[PDB]
mmCIF file of C-alpha atoms and ligand atoms in Angstrom:
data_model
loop_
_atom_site.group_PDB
_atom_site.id
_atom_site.type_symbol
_atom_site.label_atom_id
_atom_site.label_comp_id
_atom_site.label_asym_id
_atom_site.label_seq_id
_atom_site.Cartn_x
_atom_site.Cartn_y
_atom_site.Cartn_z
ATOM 1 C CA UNK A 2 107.627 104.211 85.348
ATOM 2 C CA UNK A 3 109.985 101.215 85.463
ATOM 3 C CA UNK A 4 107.917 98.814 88.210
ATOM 4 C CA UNK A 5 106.635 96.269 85.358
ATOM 5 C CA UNK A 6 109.250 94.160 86.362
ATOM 6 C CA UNK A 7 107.039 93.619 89.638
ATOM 7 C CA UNK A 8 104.302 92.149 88.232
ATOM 8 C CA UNK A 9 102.141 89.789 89.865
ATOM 9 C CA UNK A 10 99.551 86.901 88.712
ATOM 10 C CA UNK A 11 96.385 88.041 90.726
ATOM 11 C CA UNK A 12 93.020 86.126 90.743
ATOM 12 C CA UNK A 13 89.210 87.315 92.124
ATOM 13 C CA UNK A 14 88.413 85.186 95.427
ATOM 14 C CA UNK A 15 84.861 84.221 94.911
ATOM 15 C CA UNK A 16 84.035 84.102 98.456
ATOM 16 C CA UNK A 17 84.794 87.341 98.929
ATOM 17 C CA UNK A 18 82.080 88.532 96.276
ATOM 18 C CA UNK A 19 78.866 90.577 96.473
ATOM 19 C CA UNK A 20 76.287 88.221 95.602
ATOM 20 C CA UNK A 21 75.143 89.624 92.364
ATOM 21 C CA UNK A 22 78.866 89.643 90.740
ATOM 22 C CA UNK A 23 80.072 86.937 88.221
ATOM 23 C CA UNK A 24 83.491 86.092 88.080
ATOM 24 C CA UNK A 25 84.826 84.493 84.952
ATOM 25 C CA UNK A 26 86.449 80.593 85.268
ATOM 26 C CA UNK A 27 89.640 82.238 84.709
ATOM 27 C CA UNK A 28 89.349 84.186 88.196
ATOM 28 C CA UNK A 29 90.380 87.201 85.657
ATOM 29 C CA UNK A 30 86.971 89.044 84.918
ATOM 30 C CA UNK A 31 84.700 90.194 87.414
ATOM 31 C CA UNK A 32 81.110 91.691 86.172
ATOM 32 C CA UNK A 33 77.760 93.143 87.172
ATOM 33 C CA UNK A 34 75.234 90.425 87.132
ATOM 34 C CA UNK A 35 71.566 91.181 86.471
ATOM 35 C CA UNK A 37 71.596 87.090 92.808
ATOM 36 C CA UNK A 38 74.066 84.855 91.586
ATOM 37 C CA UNK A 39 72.723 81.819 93.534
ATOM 38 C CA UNK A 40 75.639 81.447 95.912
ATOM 39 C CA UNK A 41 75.152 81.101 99.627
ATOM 40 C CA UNK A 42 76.331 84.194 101.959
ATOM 41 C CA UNK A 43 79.316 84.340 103.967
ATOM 42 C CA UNK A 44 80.846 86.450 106.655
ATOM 43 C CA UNK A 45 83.739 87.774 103.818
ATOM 44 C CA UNK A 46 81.261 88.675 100.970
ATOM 45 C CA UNK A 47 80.537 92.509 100.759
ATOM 46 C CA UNK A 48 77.084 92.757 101.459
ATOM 47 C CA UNK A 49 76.171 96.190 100.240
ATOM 48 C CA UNK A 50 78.240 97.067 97.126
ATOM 49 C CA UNK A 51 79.275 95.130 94.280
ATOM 50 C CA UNK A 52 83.821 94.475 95.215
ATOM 51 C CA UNK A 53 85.272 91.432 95.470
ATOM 52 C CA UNK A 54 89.031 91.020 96.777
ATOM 53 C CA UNK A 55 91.988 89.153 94.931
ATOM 54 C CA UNK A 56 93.454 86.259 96.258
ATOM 55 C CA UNK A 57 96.850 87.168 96.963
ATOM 56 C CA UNK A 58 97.746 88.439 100.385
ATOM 57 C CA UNK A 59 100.911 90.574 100.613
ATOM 58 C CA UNK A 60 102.974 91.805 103.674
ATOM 59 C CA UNK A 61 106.853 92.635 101.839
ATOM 60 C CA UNK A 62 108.245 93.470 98.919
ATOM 61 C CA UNK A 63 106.900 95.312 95.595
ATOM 62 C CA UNK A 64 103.838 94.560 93.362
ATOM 63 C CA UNK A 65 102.722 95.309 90.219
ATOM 64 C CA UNK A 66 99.109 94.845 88.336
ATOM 65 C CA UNK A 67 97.051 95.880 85.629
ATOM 66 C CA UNK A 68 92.906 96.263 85.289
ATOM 67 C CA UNK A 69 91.088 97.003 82.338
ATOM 68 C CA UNK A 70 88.208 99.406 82.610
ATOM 69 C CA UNK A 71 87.513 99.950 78.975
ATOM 70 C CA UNK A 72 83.308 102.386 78.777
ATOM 71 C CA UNK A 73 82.697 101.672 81.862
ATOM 72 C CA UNK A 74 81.168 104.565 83.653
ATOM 73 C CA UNK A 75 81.785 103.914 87.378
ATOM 74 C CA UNK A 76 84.257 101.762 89.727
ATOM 75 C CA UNK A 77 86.715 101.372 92.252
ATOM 76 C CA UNK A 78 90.350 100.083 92.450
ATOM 77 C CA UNK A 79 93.493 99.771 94.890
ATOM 78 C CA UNK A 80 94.380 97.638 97.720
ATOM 79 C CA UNK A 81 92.955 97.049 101.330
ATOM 80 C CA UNK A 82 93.558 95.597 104.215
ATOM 81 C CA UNK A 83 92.595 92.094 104.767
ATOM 82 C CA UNK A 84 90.327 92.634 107.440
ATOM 83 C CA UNK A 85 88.563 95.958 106.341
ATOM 84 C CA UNK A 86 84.475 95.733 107.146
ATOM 85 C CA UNK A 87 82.298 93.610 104.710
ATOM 86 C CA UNK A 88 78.904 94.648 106.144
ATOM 87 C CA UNK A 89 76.736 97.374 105.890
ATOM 88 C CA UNK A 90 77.921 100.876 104.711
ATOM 89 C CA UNK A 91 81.279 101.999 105.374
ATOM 90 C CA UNK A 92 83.394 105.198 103.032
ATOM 91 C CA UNK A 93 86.347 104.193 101.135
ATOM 92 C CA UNK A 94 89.615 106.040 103.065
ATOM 93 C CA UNK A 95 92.767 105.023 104.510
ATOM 94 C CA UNK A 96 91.566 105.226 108.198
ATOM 95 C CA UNK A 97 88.975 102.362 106.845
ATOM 96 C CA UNK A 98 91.960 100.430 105.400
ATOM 97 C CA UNK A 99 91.917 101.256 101.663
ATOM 98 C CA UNK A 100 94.254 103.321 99.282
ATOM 99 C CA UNK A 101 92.035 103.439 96.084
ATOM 100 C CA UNK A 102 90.931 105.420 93.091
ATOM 101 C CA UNK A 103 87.301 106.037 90.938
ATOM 102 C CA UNK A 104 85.575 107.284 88.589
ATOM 103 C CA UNK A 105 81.991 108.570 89.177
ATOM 104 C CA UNK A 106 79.885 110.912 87.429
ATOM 105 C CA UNK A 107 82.718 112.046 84.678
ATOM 106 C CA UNK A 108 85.492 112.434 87.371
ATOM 107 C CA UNK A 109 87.977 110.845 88.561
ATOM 108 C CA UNK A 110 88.748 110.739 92.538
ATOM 109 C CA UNK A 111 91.822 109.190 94.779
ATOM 110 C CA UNK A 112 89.703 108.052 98.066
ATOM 111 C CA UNK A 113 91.508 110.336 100.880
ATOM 112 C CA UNK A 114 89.130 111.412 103.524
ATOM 113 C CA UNK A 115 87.878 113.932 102.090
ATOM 114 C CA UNK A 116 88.426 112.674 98.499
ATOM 115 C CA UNK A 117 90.961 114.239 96.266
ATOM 116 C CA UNK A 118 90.825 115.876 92.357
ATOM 117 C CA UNK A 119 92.372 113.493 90.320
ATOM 118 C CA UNK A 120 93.688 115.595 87.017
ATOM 119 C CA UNK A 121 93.333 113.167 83.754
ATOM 120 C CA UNK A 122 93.647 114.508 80.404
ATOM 121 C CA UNK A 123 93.198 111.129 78.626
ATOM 122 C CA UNK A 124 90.378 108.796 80.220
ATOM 123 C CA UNK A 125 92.350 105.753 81.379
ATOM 124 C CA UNK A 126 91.200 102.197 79.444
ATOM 125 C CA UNK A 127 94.057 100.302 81.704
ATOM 126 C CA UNK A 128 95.018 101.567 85.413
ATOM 127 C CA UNK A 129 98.383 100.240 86.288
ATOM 128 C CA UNK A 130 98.366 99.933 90.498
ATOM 129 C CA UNK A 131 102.067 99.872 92.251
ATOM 130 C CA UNK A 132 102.480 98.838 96.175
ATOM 131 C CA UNK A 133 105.565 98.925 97.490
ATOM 132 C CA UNK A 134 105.001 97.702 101.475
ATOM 133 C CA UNK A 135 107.894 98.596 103.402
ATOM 134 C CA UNK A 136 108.194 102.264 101.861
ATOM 135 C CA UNK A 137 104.165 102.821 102.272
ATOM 136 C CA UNK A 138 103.409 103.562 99.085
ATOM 137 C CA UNK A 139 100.008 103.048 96.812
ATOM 138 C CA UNK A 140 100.467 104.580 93.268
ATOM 139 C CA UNK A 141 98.263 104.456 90.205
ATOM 140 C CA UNK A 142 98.966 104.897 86.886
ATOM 141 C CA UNK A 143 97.459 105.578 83.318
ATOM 142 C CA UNK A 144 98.229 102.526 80.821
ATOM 143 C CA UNK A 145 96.689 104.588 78.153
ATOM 144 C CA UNK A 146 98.409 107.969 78.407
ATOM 145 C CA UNK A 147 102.463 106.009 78.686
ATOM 146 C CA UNK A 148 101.989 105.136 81.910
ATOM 147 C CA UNK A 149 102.109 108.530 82.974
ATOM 148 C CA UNK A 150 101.493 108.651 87.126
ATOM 149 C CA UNK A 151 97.622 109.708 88.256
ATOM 150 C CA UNK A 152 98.157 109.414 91.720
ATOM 151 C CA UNK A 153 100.637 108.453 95.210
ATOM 152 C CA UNK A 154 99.214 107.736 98.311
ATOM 153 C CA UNK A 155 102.687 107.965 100.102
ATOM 154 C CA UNK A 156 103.140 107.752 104.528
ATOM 155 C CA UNK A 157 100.527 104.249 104.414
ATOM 156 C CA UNK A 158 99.991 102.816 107.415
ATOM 157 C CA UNK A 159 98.820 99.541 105.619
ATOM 158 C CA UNK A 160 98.628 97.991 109.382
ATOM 159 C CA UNK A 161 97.970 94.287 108.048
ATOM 160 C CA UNK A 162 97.890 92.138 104.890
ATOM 161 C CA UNK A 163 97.114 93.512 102.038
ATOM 162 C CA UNK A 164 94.855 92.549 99.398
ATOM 163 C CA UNK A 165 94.054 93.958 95.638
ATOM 164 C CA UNK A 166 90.768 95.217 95.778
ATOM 165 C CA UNK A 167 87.603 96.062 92.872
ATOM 166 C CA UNK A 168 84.574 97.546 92.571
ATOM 167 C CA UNK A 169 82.872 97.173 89.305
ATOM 168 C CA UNK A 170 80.099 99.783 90.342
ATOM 169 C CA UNK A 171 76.429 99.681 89.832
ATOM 170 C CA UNK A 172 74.781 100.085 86.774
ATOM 171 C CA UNK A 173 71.169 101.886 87.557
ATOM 172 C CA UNK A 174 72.065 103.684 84.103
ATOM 173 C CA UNK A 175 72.679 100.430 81.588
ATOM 174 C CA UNK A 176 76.097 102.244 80.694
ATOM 175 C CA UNK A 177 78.123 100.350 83.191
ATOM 176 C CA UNK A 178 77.793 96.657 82.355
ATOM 177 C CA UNK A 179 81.297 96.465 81.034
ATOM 178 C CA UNK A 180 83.912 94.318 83.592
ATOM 179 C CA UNK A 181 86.891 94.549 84.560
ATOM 180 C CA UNK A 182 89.254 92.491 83.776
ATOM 181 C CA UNK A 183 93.065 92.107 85.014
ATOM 182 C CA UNK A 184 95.808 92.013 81.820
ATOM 183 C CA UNK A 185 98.142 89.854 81.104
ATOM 184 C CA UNK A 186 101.694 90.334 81.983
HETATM 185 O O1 LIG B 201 69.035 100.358 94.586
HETATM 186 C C1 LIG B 201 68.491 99.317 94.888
HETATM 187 O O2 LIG B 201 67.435 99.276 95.482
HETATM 188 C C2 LIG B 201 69.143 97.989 94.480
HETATM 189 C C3 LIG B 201 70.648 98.049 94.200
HETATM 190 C C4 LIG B 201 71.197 96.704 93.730
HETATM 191 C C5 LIG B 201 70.204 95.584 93.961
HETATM 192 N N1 LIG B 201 69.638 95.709 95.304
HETATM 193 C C6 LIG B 201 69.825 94.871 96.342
HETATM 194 O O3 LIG B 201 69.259 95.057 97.415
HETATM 195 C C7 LIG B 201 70.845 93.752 96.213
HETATM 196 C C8 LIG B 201 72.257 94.262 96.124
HETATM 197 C C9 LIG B 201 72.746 95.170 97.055
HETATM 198 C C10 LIG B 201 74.038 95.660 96.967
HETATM 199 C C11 LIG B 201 74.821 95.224 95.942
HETATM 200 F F1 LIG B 201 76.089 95.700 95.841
HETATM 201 C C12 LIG B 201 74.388 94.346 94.989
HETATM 202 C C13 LIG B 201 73.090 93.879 95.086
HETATM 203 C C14 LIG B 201 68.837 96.911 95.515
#
Protein backbone atom coordinates (compact mmCIF):
# COMPACT_ATOMS: atom_id res chain seq x y z
CA UNK A 1 0.00 0.00 0.00
CA UNK A 2 1.01 3.60 -0.73
CA UNK A 3 -1.34 5.58 2.12
CA UNK A 4 1.82 6.36 4.50
CA UNK A 5 1.80 9.58 3.11
CA UNK A 6 -1.54 10.06 5.23
CA UNK A 7 -0.27 9.73 8.38
CA UNK A 8 -1.58 11.30 11.33
CA UNK A 9 -0.17 12.32 14.98
CA UNK A 10 -2.88 10.58 17.22
CA UNK A 11 -2.95 10.78 21.09
CA UNK A 12 -5.17 8.54 23.90
CA UNK A 13 -7.92 10.99 25.48
CA UNK A 14 -7.75 10.14 29.10
CA UNK A 15 -11.23 10.93 29.78
CA UNK A 16 -12.37 8.63 27.62
CA UNK A 17 -10.57 5.67 29.57
CA UNK A 18 -11.78 2.60 31.49
CA UNK A 19 -10.77 3.25 34.88
CA UNK A 20 -8.20 0.61 35.35
CA UNK A 21 -6.07 1.71 32.07
CA UNK A 22 -2.79 3.80 32.31
CA UNK A 23 -1.91 5.94 29.65
CA UNK A 24 1.69 6.96 29.28
CA UNK A 25 2.62 11.08 29.61
CA UNK A 26 3.25 10.87 26.04
CA UNK A 27 -0.61 10.11 25.31
CA UNK A 28 1.22 7.23 23.09
CA UNK A 29 0.93 3.98 25.30
CA UNK A 30 -2.10 2.76 26.73
CA UNK A 31 -1.86 -0.42 29.27
CA UNK A 32 -3.71 -2.80 31.56
CA UNK A 33 -3.39 -1.58 35.05
CA UNK A 34 -3.53 -3.99 37.99
CA UNK A 35 -8.56 1.39 39.65
CA UNK A 36 -6.44 3.99 38.50
CA UNK A 37 -7.75 6.58 41.03
CA UNK A 38 -9.47 8.85 38.54
CA UNK A 39 -13.01 10.03 39.02
CA UNK A 40 -15.82 8.58 36.50
CA UNK A 41 -17.31 10.33 33.72
CA UNK A 42 -20.16 9.97 31.32
CA UNK A 43 -17.32 9.25 28.22
CA UNK A 44 -15.22 6.58 30.10
CA UNK A 45 -16.09 2.93 29.00
CA UNK A 46 -17.37 1.44 31.94
CA UNK A 47 -17.20 -2.24 31.22
CA UNK A 48 -14.12 -3.02 29.07
CA UNK A 49 -10.76 -1.76 29.11
CA UNK A 50 -10.76 1.02 25.34
CA UNK A 51 -10.02 4.32 25.43
CA UNK A 52 -10.57 6.67 22.23
CA UNK A 53 -7.87 8.99 20.51
CA UNK A 54 -8.18 12.48 20.48
CA UNK A 55 -8.54 13.36 17.03
CA UNK A 56 -11.99 13.67 15.56
CA UNK A 57 -12.24 13.27 11.76
CA UNK A 58 -15.14 14.00 9.28
CA UNK A 59 -12.98 14.41 5.50
CA UNK A 60 -10.18 13.44 3.96
CA UNK A 61 -7.68 10.31 4.41
CA UNK A 62 -5.84 8.98 7.54
CA UNK A 63 -3.20 6.94 8.28
CA UNK A 64 -1.86 5.23 11.76
CA UNK A 65 0.14 2.67 13.20
CA UNK A 66 -0.29 0.46 16.72
CA UNK A 67 2.06 -1.82 18.08
CA UNK A 68 0.74 -5.02 19.54
CA UNK A 69 3.96 -6.86 20.02
CA UNK A 70 2.88 -10.80 22.65
CA UNK A 71 0.01 -9.54 23.43
CA UNK A 72 -2.66 -12.14 23.42
CA UNK A 73 -5.96 -10.22 23.07
CA UNK A 74 -7.27 -6.63 21.78
CA UNK A 75 -9.20 -4.50 19.70
CA UNK A 76 -8.49 -1.78 17.05
CA UNK A 77 -10.24 0.55 14.33
CA UNK A 78 -12.27 3.58 14.43
CA UNK A 79 -15.80 4.54 15.87
CA UNK A 80 -18.10 6.89 15.91
CA UNK A 81 -17.90 9.63 18.35
CA UNK A 82 -20.95 8.99 20.04
CA UNK A 83 -21.01 5.07 20.13
CA UNK A 84 -22.37 3.74 23.84
CA UNK A 85 -19.86 3.91 26.82
CA UNK A 86 -22.03 1.99 29.32
CA UNK A 87 -22.81 -1.34 30.02
CA UNK A 88 -22.37 -4.17 27.40
CA UNK A 89 -22.75 -3.50 23.88
CA UNK A 90 -20.98 -6.02 20.61
CA UNK A 91 -18.45 -4.45 18.49
CA UNK A 92 -20.24 -4.06 14.69
CA UNK A 93 -20.86 -1.41 12.31
CA UNK A 94 -24.63 -1.02 13.18
CA UNK A 95 -23.03 -0.08 16.83
CA UNK A 96 -20.69 2.43 15.09
CA UNK A 97 -17.33 0.60 14.86
CA UNK A 98 -15.21 -0.86 11.91
CA UNK A 99 -12.53 -2.86 13.92
CA UNK A 100 -10.34 -5.90 14.08
CA UNK A 101 -9.02 -8.62 17.09
CA UNK A 102 -7.36 -11.12 18.12
CA UNK A 103 -8.81 -13.58 20.71
CA UNK A 104 -8.06 -17.00 21.56
CA UNK A 105 -5.27 -17.56 18.60
CA UNK A 106 -7.50 -15.91 15.88
CA UNK A 107 -7.84 -13.14 14.36
CA UNK A 108 -11.49 -11.55 13.61
CA UNK A 109 -12.76 -8.25 11.52
CA UNK A 110 -15.95 -7.21 13.83
CA UNK A 111 -18.92 -7.56 11.11
CA UNK A 112 -22.09 -8.72 12.66
CA UNK A 113 -21.55 -11.83 12.66
CA UNK A 114 -17.72 -11.58 12.85
CA UNK A 115 -15.58 -12.49 9.94
CA UNK A 116 -12.27 -15.10 9.43
CA UNK A 117 -9.49 -13.00 9.20
CA UNK A 118 -6.65 -15.20 7.16
CA UNK A 119 -2.98 -14.24 8.68
CA UNK A 120 -0.07 -16.24 7.88
CA UNK A 121 2.40 -14.07 9.87
CA UNK A 122 1.02 -12.82 13.40
CA UNK A 123 0.98 -9.03 13.00
CA UNK A 124 3.54 -7.06 15.70
CA UNK A 125 2.31 -3.55 13.96
CA UNK A 126 -1.40 -3.12 12.42
CA UNK A 127 -1.37 -0.29 10.01
CA UNK A 128 -5.32 1.20 10.04
CA UNK A 129 -6.39 3.36 6.73
CA UNK A 130 -9.81 5.57 6.72
CA UNK A 131 -10.60 7.21 3.90
CA UNK A 132 -14.19 9.19 4.85
CA UNK A 133 -15.80 10.23 1.81
CA UNK A 134 -15.20 6.77 -0.08
CA UNK A 135 -16.37 4.69 3.23
CA UNK A 136 -13.63 2.79 3.66
CA UNK A 137 -11.87 1.11 6.98
CA UNK A 138 -8.79 -1.05 5.98
CA UNK A 139 -6.18 -2.79 8.08
CA UNK A 140 -3.01 -3.84 7.35
CA UNK A 141 -0.01 -6.12 8.48
CA UNK A 142 3.26 -3.92 9.26
CA UNK A 143 5.04 -7.13 9.76
CA UNK A 144 4.23 -9.20 6.68
CA UNK A 145 5.10 -5.71 3.96
CA UNK A 146 2.16 -4.22 4.69
CA UNK A 147 0.31 -6.75 3.01
CA UNK A 148 -3.78 -5.90 3.38
CA UNK A 149 -5.74 -8.12 6.31
CA UNK A 150 -8.89 -6.62 5.87
CA UNK A 151 -11.59 -3.71 4.01
CA UNK A 152 -14.60 -2.80 5.51
CA UNK A 153 -15.81 -0.98 2.27
CA UNK A 154 -19.92 0.70 1.84
CA UNK A 155 -19.35 2.54 5.76
CA UNK A 156 -21.94 4.42 6.80
CA UNK A 157 -19.59 6.19 9.39
CA UNK A 158 -22.83 8.54 10.16
CA UNK A 159 -20.73 11.03 12.47
CA UNK A 160 -17.19 11.90 13.61
CA UNK A 161 -14.93 9.55 13.76
CA UNK A 162 -12.53 8.63 16.28
CA UNK A 163 -9.42 5.97 16.46
CA UNK A 164 -10.39 3.53 18.80
CA UNK A 165 -8.32 0.60 21.32
CA UNK A 166 -8.89 -2.06 23.34
CA UNK A 167 -5.94 -3.43 25.12
CA UNK A 168 -8.03 -6.54 26.37
CA UNK A 169 -8.10 -8.18 29.69
CA UNK A 170 -5.54 -10.13 31.06
CA UNK A 171 -7.31 -12.98 33.43
CA UNK A 172 -4.32 -15.15 31.91
CA UNK A 173 -1.00 -12.85 32.92
CA UNK A 174 -0.06 -13.20 29.08
CA UNK A 175 -1.65 -9.98 28.07
CA UNK A 176 0.02 -7.21 30.07
CA UNK A 177 1.88 -5.94 27.08
CA UNK A 178 0.39 -2.23 25.66
CA UNK A 179 -0.12 -0.86 22.87
CA UNK A 180 1.52 1.68 21.73
CA UNK A 181 1.04 4.00 18.48
CA UNK A 182 4.55 4.32 16.18
CA UNK A 183 6.14 6.95 15.10
CA UNK A 184 5.74 8.32 11.70
O1 LIG B 1 -13.98 -10.52 35.83
C1 LIG B 1 -14.09 -9.78 36.78
O2 LIG B 1 -14.82 -10.02 37.72
C2 LIG B 1 -13.27 -8.48 36.81
C3 LIG B 1 -12.78 -7.97 35.45
C4 LIG B 1 -11.90 -6.73 35.59
C5 LIG B 1 -12.00 -6.13 36.98
N1 LIG B 1 -13.41 -6.08 37.39
C6 LIG B 1 -14.16 -4.98 37.57
O3 LIG B 1 -15.32 -5.06 37.96
C7 LIG B 1 -13.59 -3.62 37.18
C8 LIG B 1 -13.41 -3.48 35.69
C9 LIG B 1 -14.45 -3.77 34.82
C10 LIG B 1 -14.28 -3.66 33.45
C11 LIG B 1 -13.07 -3.26 32.98
F1 LIG B 1 -12.89 -3.15 31.64
C12 LIG B 1 -12.01 -2.97 33.79
C13 LIG B 1 -12.19 -3.10 35.16
C14 LIG B 1 -14.03 -7.39 37.55
Amino acid sequence: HHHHHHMVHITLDRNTANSWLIISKDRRQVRMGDHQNVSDNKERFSNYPMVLGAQRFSSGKMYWEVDVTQKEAWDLGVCRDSVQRKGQFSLSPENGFWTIWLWQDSYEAGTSPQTTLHIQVPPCQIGIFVDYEAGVVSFYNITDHGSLIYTFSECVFAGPLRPFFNVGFNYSGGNAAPLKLCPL
